[PDB]
Amino acid sequence: NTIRVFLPNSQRTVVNVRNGMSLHDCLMKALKVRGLQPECCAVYRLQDEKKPIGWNTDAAWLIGEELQVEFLDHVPLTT
DSSP: OEEEEEETTTEEEEEEOOTTOBHHHHHHHHHHHTTOOGGGEEEEEEOOOEEEEOTTOBGGGGTTOEEEEEEOOOOOOOO
């Protein structure tokens, strides 16, 4: 019921997956503790290679896998 998440600066954390959680809601608290926001990051699925996935991914399908979170490049937004 957990996902292993590799963070920038050689950090790591374990997140619990409740039924129906999106990746955003799943990693929200753990990133906030590190002082990070998910919408300012990119997330990858580690297989064998970094494959990109969206923050609206259903996290229940990723239980038991390893993820990697990277900072987005600092480019201005239209938001």
